[PDB]
Amino acid sequence: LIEFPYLPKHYLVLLVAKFLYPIFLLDDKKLMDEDSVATVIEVIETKWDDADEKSSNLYETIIEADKSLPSSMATLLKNLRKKLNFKLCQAFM
Amino acid sequence: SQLIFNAQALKDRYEGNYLSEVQNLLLGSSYDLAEMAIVTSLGPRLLLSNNPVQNNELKTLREILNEFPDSERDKWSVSINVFEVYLKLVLDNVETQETIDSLISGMKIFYDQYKHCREVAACCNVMSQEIVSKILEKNNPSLPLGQPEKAYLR
Amino acid sequence: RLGHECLSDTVRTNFLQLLLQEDIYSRDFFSTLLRLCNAHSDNGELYLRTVDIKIVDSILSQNLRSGDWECFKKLYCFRMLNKSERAAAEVLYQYILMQADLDVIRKRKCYLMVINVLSSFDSAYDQWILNGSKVVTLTDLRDELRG
Amino acid sequence: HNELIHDAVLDYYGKRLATCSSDKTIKIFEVEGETHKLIDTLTGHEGPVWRVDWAHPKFGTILASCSYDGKVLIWKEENGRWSQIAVHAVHSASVNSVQWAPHEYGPLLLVASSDGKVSVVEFKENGTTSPIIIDAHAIGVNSASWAPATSRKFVTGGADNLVKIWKYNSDAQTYVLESTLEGHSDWVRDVAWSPTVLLRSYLASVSQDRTCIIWTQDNEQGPWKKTLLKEEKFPDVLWRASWSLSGNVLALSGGDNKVTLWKENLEGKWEPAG
């Protein structure tokens, strides 16, 4: 509802880090979300196309107070590949 | 005549068709020290045409190694037959505990050899993967983690 | 899963194509069909942890081409024809594109997650040698992001 | 940009050319004649670009690229695409020279910078840049050409105005100060050692004083001898100097576009020639 210039969208990279590694995506296998496996595959489109989203004033010493996988467990959004591959299971096409 | 042929394979060398004329340093056959230089072409692309005629042809290519004159303290074939004992465990199934081969040893020498280029170090990790059930992997398979496969032992 | 001398009660091993002719109309097995240990992989069919190799890369492939039904035998897996180390992670993604046409989902799903294997080494050496990198030979299939 | 071009130097084959400018890039324009062909525009820099040099070929063709920001980017084609395989950024100030060692010597790029420094880039066993820091001129080292065989040798051009000859020894591990020259009175632009195919090297040590002082070694064991290209201050200020691979012919372009084919004749006169 907010697909304008208006509100910038570079906050959505601190916010969703330990959103998407916990159980709100998926972190098991075979979880489905209501109208929201097909609107979160188009913002992790961005984050593998060229480059992860910007913030690094507060995400390059706050990912290590979050305990997210990219800077902490060495492995990047190749563990959010794992957490889309485990709903090529039978919960997203 | 031969001198102009030893400047052809320095001239027509470019970085697109590096392998075309580093092959005509190998098969050039008046050269020496092309024996680990072929390894900086065919390491970044161990892609070939992958049949037992290209592999038996690649046997004929590591016999060019011994055709070269033998230098003081340089020239060896006891760690370059690594990539030729590779072409003997890829037409054969048999789990090797080194009853057969100098080739898991040969990879480990090839992680103290790799010189020029760290994709000459990572091909050593790729030829690890092409030989599974025929090795038990006392080397490593090949940020990109999601699926290295940690189960191959029996 | 057929042992090491228990492959003589299925000495017809191209019978395991034919089991699976009428077996799958249904998703009830595919979970165990990834390279993962005994946990996730013992609920349904065999484990790709310790198992013989014909069972894998001959038996499951000869069935895989055949249209016998699941859409998840046209799609899902990415470690189903891993029994070979990081291998058909790259090239079962394009196994999709060999059966089916290159179109939208099947396009940019499979190019975005394979380009951060195949240029996260990032200078285009060949990783899994039979197709190699995504920028020696599928740089065409990285302008098919758009479209 | 391509209109306040500051370098365009070829490889030893003469088939590859790399032109830089105030473009903040290296637009690769290889020689197909007076037509050239783009292969990639290399962006990595911030600010004006001064010198590039391809490698002498026995260790690839490998394009260094020195620039305002502090940075020398080692570019190399690896499987028909480019990749900056190392970064050599040990400087803060304007980096002003990059010149590979000739393939009569081994892998030894020569980086020079007006921060005070010469840097003899040692290619390690993955192509991993590691310099030994040396100083020639303590105002800044504005240039650095190599001395091939007409052990290892080079020359650097002063912002102290001196043109110091640097000669390698292996019982002290660094470039011993061989000699020190000076007929200069404003800063050195370019120090160009001649690649003569015989015992002889002249050095058109190009200066901002509106003068170029050709030091001459008639044979290498003859000393450095002060002569001038002409014996007056030039109207304008003098740019890039080269010497041929066979003939030892000077070539420089002036500010007013002084075409220079003035080679030293019998009589000792820098004499107009073809």
Do residues C43 and C31 lie in contact, with contact meaning Cβ atoms separated by under 8 Å? yes
Contacts of D150 (CB under 8 A, 6+ apart): D194, D195, D196, D197, D198, D199, D200, D201, D220
DSSP B86: G
Could you tell me the two tokens for B15? Answer: 């970085």
Cα–Cα nearest to D53, from D158, D179, D143: D143
Chain-centre distance for alpha carbon C1: 18
Contact C122 D83 (CB under 8 A): yes
Residue type, C59: I
DSSP class per residue in D140-167: -EEEEEE------EEEEEESSS-EEEEE
Contact in structure between D164 and D179 (CB atoms under 8 Å) = yes
- Is A48's CB within 8 Å of C112's CB? yes
Residue pointed to by tokens 């003589």: C8
Instruction: Report the DSSP beta bridge partners of residue D66.
Output: D51, D72
Q: Report yes or no: C124 and D78 within 8 Å, Cβ to Cβ.
A: yes
D3-274 has CATH 2.60.40.3080 classification: no
Sheet holding D175-179, edge to edge: D141-146, D153-158, D163-168, D175-179
Cβ pair C37, B138 in contact under 8 A:
no
Query: Measuring CA to CA, which residue among D16, D17, D20, D18 is closest to residue D2?
Result: D20
Q: Largest Cα–Cα distance of chain B, in whole Å? A: 58
Neighbours of chain C (3+ CB pairs under 8 A): A, B, D
Record: contact C120-B123, CB cut-off 8 A: no
Q: Report the residue from D57, D76, D125 with minimal CB separation from B10.
A: D57
- Nearest Cα neighbor of D175 from D103, D117, D225 is D117
- Three-state secondary structure along chain C? CCCCCCCCCCCCCCHHHHHHHHHCCCCCCHHHCCCCCCCCCCCCCCCCCCCCCHHHHCHHHHHHHCCCCCCCCCCCCCCCCCCCCCCCCCCCHHHHHHHCCCCHHHHHHHHHCCCCCCCCCCCCCCCCCCCCCCCCCCHHHHCCCCC
**Which is nearest to A90 in space by CA: C38, C28, C64?**
C28
Edge-to-edge strand ranges of the sheet holding D36-43: D7-10, D17-20, D25-31, D36-43
Query: Would you kindly state where each structural domain of chain D is located, as residue ranges?
Result: 3-274
Structure solved via: cryo-EM
Q: In whole angstroms, give the CA distance from residue B138 to residue D192.
A: 55
Question: Rounded to 5, what percent of chain D is helix, strand, coil?
Answer: 0, 45, 55
Resolution (A): 11.6
Question: Nearest CA of chain A to the CA of B142: how many Å?
Answer: 14
Chain centroid to CA B145: how far?
Answer: 26
Which phi and psi angles does C39 have, rounded to 5°?
Answer: -165, -50
In terms of Cα–Cα distance, which of D114, D206, D128, D119 is closest to D154?
A: D119
Exposed e or buried b per residue across B57-93, where buried means at least 16 C-beta atoms within 10 angstroms of its C-beta: eeeebbebbeebeeeeeeeeeeebbbbbbbbebeeee
In angstroms, the Cα distances linking B87 to A79, B127, B153, C58, C131 are 36, 11, 22, 22, 19
Name which of C85, C121, C123 is nearest B149 (Cβ-Cβ): C85
B45 vs C125: CB contact, 8 Å cut-off? yes
Unique residue bearing structure tokens 């990279």: A13
